[PDB]
Amino acid sequence: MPNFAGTWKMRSSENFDELLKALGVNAMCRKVAVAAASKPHVEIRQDGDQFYIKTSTTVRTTEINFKVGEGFEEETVDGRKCRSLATWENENKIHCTQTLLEGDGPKTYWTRELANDELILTFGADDVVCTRIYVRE
Amino acid sequence: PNFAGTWKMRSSENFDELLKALGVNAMCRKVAVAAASKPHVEIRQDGDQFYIKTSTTVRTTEINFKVGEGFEEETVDGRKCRSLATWENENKIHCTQTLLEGDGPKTYWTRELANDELILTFGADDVVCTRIYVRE
Ligand SMILES: CCCCCCCCCCCCCC(=O)O
Ligand SMILES: CCCCCCCCCCCCC(=O)O
């Protein structure tokens, strides 16, 4: 029912450096990630529950393909392989639960919500929350 | 010796081990080693006065120094340091470093001209990384 599809550009970021610190990312990498990941561009294709999400920066591009309610594999923000499940949390919000394939680490998740035609991306690592707001371009 | 010119890296040794000695975690080392795999360097030199720009797609650094005079730069892992370059021989500059802030391994770099190749060495405690540059 909500239409996530389109091209998006990041307008604002809260607590990204703190999220990377909670994931144990070294400052050498955080310094580049915070500079470069200051202006990601996102493309979404959506057909009902079926999604394609591509996030690109000069430093790193990721693409995921998933159906809401079906398991898939992706990476955490710090690049660790995880098994994921996206659920509708409400009519305008996808909540994605994540479990590491290998090893131990903080509990991670992401959410994507459409609110007043803005795309709110939240990432969790234990009790740390990062909020990135995307707008249409 | 004429360090001036444009240079491209042909080989690297022990960069992963150097970043480990600097306390960089494995996931970060894998990305950093890849990101640093082929820097392009521009040097301008006028006697003892040096300008060194090192560029990669993800990160560019520039330093200006005179041999024998203190300056401030960053370690490889991006920690602010106070530095001093000296001639170790006719074709070799040795740069001693001290952290401005916090504690960490003893670091230094050397740049040497040998058979018109540019040999960059980084030290962190007893670990040595060697990077060899050739003229572009
Ligand atoms: C998220 C990406 C983090 C990337 C951090 C690596 C930064 C580039 C290192 C450049 C080292 C060049 C050393 C040299 O002068 O040969
Ligand atoms: C080991 C290095 C980990 C650092 C991660 C870099 C991430 C850069 C781009 C992330 C984009 C986040 C977003 O979707 O807004």
Author numbering:
A (entry chain AAA): 1 to 137
B (entry chain BBB): 2 to 137
Could you share sentences copied from the article?
The cellular retinoic acid-binding proteins CRABPI and CRABPII act as gatekeepers and facilitators for the passage of all-trans-retinoic acid (and related derivatives) through the cytoplasm to access retinoic acid receptors (RARs) in the nucleus. In this article, crystal structures are presented of the L29C mutant of Homo sapiens CRABPI in complex with naturally occurring fatty acids (1.64 Å resolution) and with the synthetic retinoid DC645 (2.41 Å resolution), and of CRABPII in complex with the ligands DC479 (1.80 Å resolution) and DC645 (1.71 Å resolution). The retinoic acid-binding ability of both CRABPI and CRABPII is centred on a hydrophobic pocket created by an orthogonal β-sheet fold and capped with a pair of antiparallel α-helices formed from residues 15–35 partway into the sequence. The pocket contains, at its most buried end, a trio of residues (Arg112, Arg132 and Tyr134 in CRABPI; Arg112, Arg133 and Tyr135 in CRABPII) that are responsible for binding to the carboxylic acid moiety of ATRA, usually in concert with a water molecule that is conserved in all structures with similarly binding ligands.
As part of crystal-screening efforts, we identified that an L29C mutation in Homo sapiens CRABPI allowed vastly improved crystallization and diffraction to atomic resolution, which was subsequently determined to be due to partial dimerization at the mutated surface residue. This mutation is found on the outer edge of the cap helices and as such does not affect the make-up of the hydrophobic binding site. The crystal structure resulting from molecular replacement contained unknown density in the ligand-binding sites of both independent monomers that was not suitable for fitting either ATRA or the synthetic ligands used for co-crystallization. It was determined that this density was most likely to represent fatty-acid byproducts from expression that were incorporated into the binding site based on their hydrophobic structure and carboxylic acid head group, and it was therefore fitted as the 14-carbon myristic acid (MYR) and the 13-carbon tridecanoic acid (TDA) in the two monomers. CRABPI shares high sequence similarity with other members of the fatty acid-binding protein family and so the incorporation of MYR/TDA molecules is a logical step for a protein produced recombinantly in E. coli in the absence of its natural ligand. Similarly, it has been shown that RXRs and other retinoid-binding proteins treat fatty acids (including myristic acid) as ligands, and so it is possible that nongenomic pathways are similarly influenced. To date, CRABPI had only been crystallized using the proteins from M. musculus and B. taurus. Whilst they are nearly identical, H. sapiens CRABPI contains a single amino-acid shift from alanine to proline at position 86.
